Design an enzyme around this catalytic site. Structure first.
Site, short mmCIF file in Angstrom:
data_model
loop_
_atom_site.label_atom_id
_atom_site.label_comp_id
_atom_site.label_asym_id
_atom_site.label_seq_id
_atom_site.Cartn_x
_atom_site.Cartn_y
_atom_site.Cartn_z
N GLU A 106 -22.64 11.61 -13.99
CA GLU A 106 -24.08 10.87 -14.70
C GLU A 106 -23.77 9.04 -14.75
O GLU A 106 -24.45 8.48 -15.22
CB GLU A 106 -23.68 11.37 -16.28
N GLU A 119 -14.52 -8.79 11.02
CA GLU A 119 -14.93 -7.61 10.23
C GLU A 119 -16.70 -8.33 10.22
O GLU A 119 -17.00 -7.26 9.81
CB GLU A 119 -14.44 -8.84 9.21
N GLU A 147 -0.68 3.20 10.80
CA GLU A 147 0.62 1.88 10.85
C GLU A 147 1.52 2.55 9.64
O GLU A 147 2.06 2.69 8.63
CB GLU A 147 0.65 0.75 10.26
N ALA A 169 -4.76 -2.23 2.85
CA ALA A 169 -5.77 -2.14 1.24
C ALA A 169 -5.47 -0.71 0.36
O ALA A 169 -5.33 -1.45 -0.36
CB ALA A 169 -6.87 -2.44 1.86
N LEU A 209 -18.52 11.55 -14.22
CA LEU A 209 -19.20 10.42 -12.44
C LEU A 209 -20.50 11.04 -11.96
O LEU A 209 -20.90 9.86 -11.72
CB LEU A 209 -17.47 11.15 -11.59
N1 LIG Z 1 -7.89 -6.91 -1.62
C1 LIG Z 1 -6.62 -6.50 -1.01
N2 LIG Z 1 -7.16 -6.32 -0.25
C2 LIG Z 1 -7.38 -5.98 1.48
C3 LIG Z 1 -5.01 -6.33 0.97
N3 LIG Z 1 -4.61 -5.84 2.71
C4 LIG Z 1 -5.40 -5.46 3.34
N4 LIG Z 1 -7.04 -6.72 2.12
C5 LIG Z 1 -8.51 -6.28 2.64
O1 LIG Z 1 -8.41 -5.54 4.53
C6 LIG Z 1 -8.88 -5.72 5.67
C7 LIG Z 1 -8.16 -5.49 6.46
O2 LIG Z 1 -7.53 -4.36 6.59
P1 LIG Z 1 -6.21 -3.36 6.40
O3 LIG Z 1 -6.81 -3.20 5.26
O4 LIG Z 1 -5.73 -4.32 7.19
O5 LIG Z 1 -6.20 -2.25 7.86
P2 LIG Z 1 -5.34 -2.14 8.24
O6 LIG Z 1 -4.19 -0.76 7.03
O7 LIG Z 1 -4.36 -3.17 8.85
O8 LIG Z 1 -5.53 -1.58 9.79
P3 LIG Z 1 -4.60 -1.27 10.47
O9 LIG Z 1 -5.30 -2.16 11.86
O10 LIG Z 1 -4.92 0.15 11.83
O11 LIG Z 1 -3.73 -1.45 10.27
C8 LIG Z 1 -8.66 -7.48 5.44
O12 LIG Z 1 -9.82 -7.47 5.93
C9 LIG Z 1 -8.39 -7.67 3.83
O13 LIG Z 1 -9.29 -8.58 3.82
C10 LIG Z 1 -4.99 -6.27 -0.02
O14 LIG Z 1 -3.73 -5.93 -0.56
N5 LIG Z 1 -5.12 -6.21 -0.82
MG LIG Z 2 -2.66 -1.77 9.31
#
Ligand SMILES: Nc1nc2c(ncn2[C@@H]2O[C@H](COP(=O)(O)OP(=O)(O)OP(=O)(O)O)[C@@H](O)[C@H]2O)c(=O)[nH]1
Ligand SMILES: [Mg+2]
Ligand SMILES: Nc1nc2c(ncn2[C@@H]2O[C@H](COP(=O)(O)CP(=O)(O)OP(=O)(O)O)[C@@H](O)[C@H]2O)c(=O)[nH]1
Ligand SMILES: [Mg+2]
Lengths: 426, 428
Positions: free
Chosen positions: B245, B174, B62, B12, B243
């Protein structure tokens, strides 16, 4: 990185294995000689997951082709993509142990267990990091169920911190090429409920049924069945084996799909399945793959998803799509089929995507689903078991070799306790 | 001499890092090499003659994520070591990220940002990008944010959480991890921004007219609101906003610091020529019940404070006239104790657009970070998801087996629980 070993057992696993690498070698452009010829670099970046990098920039898999008779591996050596395997990993036995679980589990497996625990102990610590363990067997035979169950039972007590998985071809009443496969499967499930945290209960019954209505082939060989399972588990691992817009490895899907330890018996799927003629007419799009993979006929198992409700599912895509059309539909799936999904757990889906497609196709998915429909599977084996166990028939092959009679009643109690939990949450 | 830096967690955050740093390198003219053919002093570090490098860390367990960068086009731009990379992912688990796998990798990331902190003359704060999915974005940031609370207690600690939508959830756990992650962010972070995946979909679906939006198009929008917050530092302006403020105006109480975000002008190229964008229009566009990037009902929730950050060719009178229109509207209300709920920010830098970008080139634009009670509704939905499955004791043994206790889950809910009452009490 996040490497993993690959084990076989019996006619099933070794034949599934022969096509497990028919496709993965194509996913990486690997020849049967083990040489890299593929053009992409995304495929070569994570060659280390399955392949010990050999000399002359060659690659050879872990691929512990174990069997109690040499009839399989003598065929696999001649088979396509058979030379790439290591000959040291061809762990053979004298007699195939027959369909007798105990004679393939207790003594004749113990005669060979030390030969295969050392080579996996060699490959395991040789790996930089291992994600887990993965094998391919059947619950009906004695080989895949006797030592293939002993093997993972000894690997967990040696490596309990590591998750693992197993693709067990369960028996079936219609396609029943074995008499005592209730006993072989009732006794292996006694171990797999605790000695493995995710089991993909494929069944050879459906794999024909899929290929008649969907593929519409006139000569489905065992290979043609295996081409589904080989390209199936490749999808389960494609998350970590390739880059992805959103990744779900073996652990990331196992942890969030398995609510309770006992409840980890799954059913896989594979969306794009078409005859060579009817593929042109069907525009493959995420809303159409999705409805194609949640239905009863696409999933490969001997159960009905309509009867039992879903607990958890997952959809490991292998295409360059948008996550809008994916999740808007899979919410629509839970709106239309809200009765079929469990209410306790909202949003039962665990989606995953990979940027690269497989060879020939532009899009693909795989439907792993933990349902209460497999209740009927184990509920049916307990009926076959109980009728065959009420009259103490076929036992003296088990009782003479070992396998005290008390253990049979323990196995059915757990499976009766197993389905007791599925109906408890249903 | 301001030195705002940005750490990134999870795919993310990392994939947002690909968007945020693709954006910044387009703002300053930094080539993808890192060598430009001052503004960059905040985010980048000058090196050698013309080589500039970002002040960031893409920590992610990862390895498959970071390898896209190390195998991408910004290979020779990012410093090699600050692309920290573990070996086994947290696998959607607070426990596997908070304690177990975290201990193996904090030594690499902490010592690198410390090499960035001391290298900076004086830094405002670090920008975090962590999702509440459960992996690194939930647990590995929890340990990371507290270790920086003791190391850097004075400094501002921003973040941009991709909050899971109530209707749609990309994973199954989640409802758990988001409730576990609430503790570290309300006690450490000074103001924690929230974003939904379903919200951004509706913007780019309705307004931009894209029925196949990808994460390279979502994050390309969150790249802008982040740039909007930091353009006051990164560039000059007739009326700047810092930031310290910025958060002072949103945060009347120490716990009530979870605003949402909004970015009004989101229109296609051909859509631009038909409709002239006026300061009174982009202002009114922000206050829509759907243009915001959080799935909630601003009509039901009273606003508490706002920081409208206009940018581009903008004047102050029409902002002062626009906000006058807002107070007259009955659908838009404000709490009794707050007479003034409008902070304002202008700067002469327009928003930069990625080439081949869904966003359009507009002479002006606006971002506003509203703190309001409308966010209590989004959280009430997922707290109902948590206690529902938690009543069944689902997926807890995967955490208990990793080391945490069953009592922690009730405490995290209690922290979220009392947090809900705060928005209700102040609403009175
Ligand atoms: N806006 C947005 N949200 C994302 C993206 N990729 C994942 N997410 C959100 O992140 C959440 C999943 O967490 P990740 O950031 O994939 O965590 P991770 O890096 O997989 O961590 P591990 O599970 O340990 O590999 C989900 O609920 C998605 O909604 C992205 O490219 N854009
Ligand atoms: Mg991941
Ligand atoms: N879908 C598929 N099913 C298979 C395949 N090969 C075997 N099988 C099925 O799996 C079952 C397992 O039989 P086995 O592989 O154990 C034969 P083997 O002599 O090696 O077992 P033992 O009786 O333990 O010696 C059997 O009932 C077959 O119907 C295959 O390629 N595909
Ligand atoms: Mg056999």
């Amino acid at each position: 990185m996040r490497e993993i070993v690959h084990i076989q057992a019996g006619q099933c696993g070794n034949q599934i294995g022969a096509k497990f690498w028919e496709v993965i070698s194509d996913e990486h452009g690997i020849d049967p000689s083990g040489n890299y010829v593929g053009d992409s670099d995304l495929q070569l970046e994570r060659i280390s997951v399955y392949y010990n990098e050999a000399s002359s920039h060659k690659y050879v898999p872990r691929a512990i082709l174990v069997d109690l008779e040499p009839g399989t591996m003598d065929s696999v050596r001649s088979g396509a993509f058979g030379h790439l395997f290591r000959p040291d990993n061809f762990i053979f036995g004298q007699s195939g142990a027959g369909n007798n679980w105990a004679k393939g589990h207790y003594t004749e497996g113990a005669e060979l267990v030390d030969s295969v625990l050392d080579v996996v102990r060699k490959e395991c610590e040789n790996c930089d990091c291992l994600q887990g363990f993965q094998l391919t067997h059947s619950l009906g035979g004695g080989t895949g169920s006797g030592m293939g169950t002993l093997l993972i039972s000894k690997v967990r007590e040696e490596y309990p911190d590591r998750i693992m998985n197993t693709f067990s071809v369960v028996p079936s009443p219609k396609v029943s090429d074995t008499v005592v496969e209730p006993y072989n499967a009732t006794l292996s499930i006694h171990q797999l409920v605790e000695n493995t945290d995710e089991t993909y209960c494929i069944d050879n019954e459906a794999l024909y049924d899929i290929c008649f209505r969907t593929l519409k082939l006139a000569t489905p060989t065992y290979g043609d069945l295996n081409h589904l399972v080989s390209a199936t588990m490749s999808g389960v691992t494609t998350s970590l084996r390739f880059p992805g817009q959103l990744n779900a490895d073996l652990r990331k899907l196992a942890v969030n799909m398995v609510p309770f330890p006992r409840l980890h018996f799954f059913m896989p799927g594979f969306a794009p399945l078409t005859a060579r003629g009817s593929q042109q007419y069907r525009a493959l799009t995420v809303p159409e793959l999705t409805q194609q993979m949640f239905d009863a006929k696409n999933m490969m198992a001997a159960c009905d998803p309509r009867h039992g409700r879903y607990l958890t599912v997952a959809t490991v895509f292998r295409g360059r799509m948008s996550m809008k059309e994916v999740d808007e539909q899979m919410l629509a799936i839970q709106s239309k089929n809200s009765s079929y999904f469990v209410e306790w757990i909202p949003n039962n889906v665990k989606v995953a995507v990979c940027d690269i497609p497989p060879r020939g196709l532009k899009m693909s998915s795989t439907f792993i689903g933990n349902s209460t429909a497999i209740q009927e599977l184990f509920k049916r084996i307990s009926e076959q078991f109980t009728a065959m166990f009420r009259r103490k028939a076929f036992l003296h092959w088990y009782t003479g070799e070992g396998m005290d009679e008390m253990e049979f009643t323990e196995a059915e109690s757990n499976m009766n306790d197993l389905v007791s939990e599925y109906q408890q949450y249903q | 001499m301001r030195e705002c830096i940005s750490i990134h967690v999870g795919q993310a955050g990392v994939q947002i890092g690909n968007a945020c740093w693709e954006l910044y390198c387009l703002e300053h003219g930094i080539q993808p090499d890192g060598q430009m053919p001052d503004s960059f002093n905040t985010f980048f570090s000058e090196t050698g003659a013309g080589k500039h490098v970002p002040r960031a860390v893409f920590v992610d367990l990862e390895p498959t994520v970071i390898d896209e960068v190390r195998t991408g086009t910004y290979r020779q731009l990012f410093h090699p070591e600050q692309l920290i990379t573990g070996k086994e992912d947290a696998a959607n688990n607070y426990a596997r990220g908070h304690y177990t796998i975290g201990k193996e990798i904090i030594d690499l990331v902490l010592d690198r940002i410390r090499k960035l902190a001391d290298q900076c003359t004086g830094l405002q704060g670090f920008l975090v990008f962590h999702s509440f999915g459960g992996g690194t974005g939930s647990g590995f940031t929890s340990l990371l944010m507290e270790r920086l609370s003791v190391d850097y207690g004075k400094k501002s600690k921003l973040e941009f959480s991709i909050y899971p939508a109530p209707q749609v959830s990309t994973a199954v756990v989640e409802p758990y991890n988001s409730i576990l992650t609430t503790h570290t962010t309300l006690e450490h972070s000074d103001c924690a921004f929230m974003v939904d995946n379903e919200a951004i979909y509706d913007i780019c679906r309705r307004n931009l007219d894209i029925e196949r939006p990808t994460y390279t198009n979502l994050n390309r929008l969150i790249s802008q609101i982040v740039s909007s917050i930091t353009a006051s530092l990164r560039f000059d302006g007739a009326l700047n906003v810092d930031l310290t403020e910025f958060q002072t105006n949103l945060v009347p109480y120490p716990r009530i610091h979870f605003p949402l975000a909004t970015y009004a002008p989101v229109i296609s190229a051909e859509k631009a020529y038909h409709e002239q964008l006026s300061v009174a229009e982009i202002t009114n566009a922000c206050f829509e019940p759907a243009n915001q990037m959080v799935k909630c009902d601003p009509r039901h929730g009273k606003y508490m404070a706002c920081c409208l950050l206009y940018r581009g060719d903008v004047v102050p009178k029409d902002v002062n006239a626009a906000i006058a229109t807002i107070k007259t509207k009955r659908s838009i209300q404000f709490v009794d104790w707050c007479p003034t709920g409008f902070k304002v920010g202008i700067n002469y830098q327009p928003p930069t657009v990625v080439p081949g970008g869904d966003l359009a080139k507009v002479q002006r634009a606006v971002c506003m970070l509203s703190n309001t009670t409308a966010i209590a509704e989004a959280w009430a939905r997922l707290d109902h998801k948590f206690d529902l499955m938690y009543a069944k004791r689902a997926f807890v043994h995967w955490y208990v087996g990793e080391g945490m206790e069953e009592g922690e889950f009730s405490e995290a809910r209690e922290d979220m629980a009392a947090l809900e009452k705060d928005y209700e009490e102040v609403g009175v």
